[PDB]
Amino acid sequence: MNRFWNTKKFSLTNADGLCATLNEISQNDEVLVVQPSVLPVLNSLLTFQDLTQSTPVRKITLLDDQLSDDLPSALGSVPQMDLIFLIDVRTSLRLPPQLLDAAQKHNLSSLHIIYCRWKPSFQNTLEDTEQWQKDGFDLNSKKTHFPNVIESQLKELSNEYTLYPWDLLPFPQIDENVLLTHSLYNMENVNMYYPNLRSLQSATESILVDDMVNSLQSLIFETNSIITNVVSIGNLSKRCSHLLKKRIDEHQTENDLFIKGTLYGERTNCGLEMDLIILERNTDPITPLLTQLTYAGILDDLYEFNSGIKIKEKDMNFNYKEDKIWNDLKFLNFGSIGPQLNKLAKELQTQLQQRQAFLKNHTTLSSDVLKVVETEEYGSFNKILELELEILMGNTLNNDIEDIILELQYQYEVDQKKILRLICLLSLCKNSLREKDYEYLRTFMIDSWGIEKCFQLESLAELGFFTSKTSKSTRLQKEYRYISQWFNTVPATFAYSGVVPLTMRLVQMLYDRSILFHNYSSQQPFILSREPRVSQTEDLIEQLYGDSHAIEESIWVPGEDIALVVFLGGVTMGEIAIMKHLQKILGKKGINKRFIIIADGLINGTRIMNSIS
Amino acid sequence: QQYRKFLSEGWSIHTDDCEICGKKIWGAGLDPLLFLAWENVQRHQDMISVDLKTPLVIFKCHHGFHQTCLENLAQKPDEYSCLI
């Protein structure tokens, strides 16, 4: 807020707007009807008690076909004032049929709905006071617009179209530092980047990039920032950067270009820098599939977080704004939790009961997790780690891989997803697999897991995960054993099998070429540069991607620090753990910066496997 | 005529900063906080509230000084005199 990104301050605006709208609906007893996908987000913002006390609504429901049978049971009952639906139409451009069938059948006499949208900063605070009646109606907005958007398909029943545009802007839930935008799923639980229908990839990609650009524009115009340097990586990031630049340069108002002349300008500057490094998940498919070792990573891949940051099996919330025990243990390694918990418990003995309840709950949950790690296919949780560590450095032999893949297939029972992920990593690590092993691996797969597995192994065999030795979308076509020489991923590191992520070193090289100095270096343009630059580092990335055009460096202004590292394609939460380590080590070395990680939705190995199915 | 001609002319500043706290007020290299403070005013008039409440004082000596900086020397704000 006001050039200082007070992230928690973003939370209040959405709640205030929703409360004002709901209280301005009607001063009676209201019943709320909320879409299943958006409800968890709303509950993570407004508590039930606050919702009841602030506005006279007293009931919340869900959009389901069960309501059709309950139309004469639930909808017929209550209905003290009216029914206020809440829908999300930001993606999939289609209203759910539930409201369509309920409107005509139950014959509601008052239809009011709520639709979500990003904040229209271009409205610039209603533009003063309409310029004293538009200086004699010199400007007007009647019919100066298309008749309807998306909701033009709603042209049935009555004219009760009291729409209400509730505003929404990103706010942090999992942690103070990192915000999160939900644009990676539809209402049908289909991945927005890896859809299970290989006929409409291009449109889905365009829609995703458009929505991401819209969210970034909303945040940028809300915070009143001036981007100075852009480091785009990949193909889609190029289009995203160009579209964002065009949209910023088109829709910006006046009274700020004048400031753009005063600040920065010609022959002078004021020492303000913001960076917009952008990456794509397809660039490095090496590390969304490794096993998590941090506490929240282990707790995540065994029990999937929903849209809200909570879990079904437990009841206590993991929100950071009311508890401090979770703050200091979320990103620590699993091994260093026990003794720390023992010390925390023993120090309080000499020494309010809410802390006791919190520590008891944490101890019980940790004990349950430790118990469930073992005795549940004992040794698998470690065996996969040793196998992954062996594969990453490279120890594959002639036809011996077929012996170990089925070694744990039925000796220890294991899910399909683990095997599929491991074989994908095997096929991806060597950057190529010969033509004499697919004929056996695919045969065994189709033998053991049905007939539909052939379709999965065919569809997944074109995104780059499952390739054969015999508009490129920026795949990776270089052996990984080479990358272990330029970079020092395998020696400082946690949340993995002792391996540094590839994105980690990719962002490291932009500011300090130390590891690149040890290997493949005789001269460098610099050793410590404050501004992001890319020079004399083309050939290494020319062979790494097959084209010396993936790297893009853009300077916008002609002539401590906020860096916006967005993530198009999900964030593997282990990267968040190493981001803090990067910030700490860079601050120690001398360069002081602050990182904000924009995420389109948490991504994880198993969560990917159901996507392409 | 000489007295009349010497009551409308202005004066410039030749020094780059005061002589009691260093810093700089004229040449390129201002603190970004001042630039942000100017942006807060004359753009939206939201709220000008910050510790930067020191108005610069210009003198015939052209050296220039702050107000709180001179107040630190137990100088009443009615007898401001340059230190030469």
3-state per-residue secondary structure call for A525-588: CCCCCCCCCCCCCCHHHHHHHCCCCCEEEEECCCCCCEEEEEEECCECHHHHHHHHHHHHHHHH
| Interchain pair A268, B40: CB under 8 A | no
Give me B43's structure tokens: 């753009």
Q: Which amino acid is at B27?
A: G
Kind plus residue range of the DSSP H or E element containing A231: strand A229-233
| Interchain pair A270, B35: CB under 8 A | yes
Q: Which amino acid is at A380?
A: S
| Interchain pair B32, A268: CB under 8 A | no
- Environment class of B10 (CB within 10 Å of its CB; exposed 0-12, middle 13-18, buried 19+): exposed
Q: Give the resolution value in Å.
A: 4.6
Q: Which residues pair with A111 in a beta bridge?
A: A83
In this structure, the dihedral spanned by the alpha carbons of residues A69, A71, A76 and A77, taken in order and rounded to 10 degrees, is 70
| Backbone interruptions in chain A following residues (C to N > 2.5 Å) | 351, 470, 491, 559
d(CA A248, CA A494): 39
Task: Give the chain A residue nearest B34 (alpha carbons).
Answer: A270
Alpha helices in A312-379 (DSSP H): 338-350, 353-373
Q: Which residues pair with A602 in a beta bridge?
A: A571
User: How large is the C-alpha radius of gyration of chain A?
Assistant: 27
CB A520 within 8 A of CB A554: no
In this structure, the dihedral spanned by the alpha carbons of residues A511, A517, A522 and A523, taken in order and rounded to 10 degrees, is 20
Q: What are phi and psi of A327, to 5 degrees?
A: -65, -40
CB A554 within 8 A of CB A232: yes
CB A231 within 8 A of CB A280: no
Which residues from A are below 8 Å from B when comparing CB atoms?
Answer: 2-3, 255-256, 259, 262-263, 268, 270-272
Alpha helices in A87-235 (DSSP H): 97-106, 124-127, 130-137, 201-223
The DSSP-derived string for A168-208 is: E----SS-SS------SB-TT--BSSS-S-TT-HHHHHHHH
Which of B28, B36, B38 is nearest residue A3 as measured by Cβ atoms?
Answer: B36
3-state per-residue secondary structure call for A395-406: CCCCCCHHHHHC
- The DSSP call for residue B24 is -
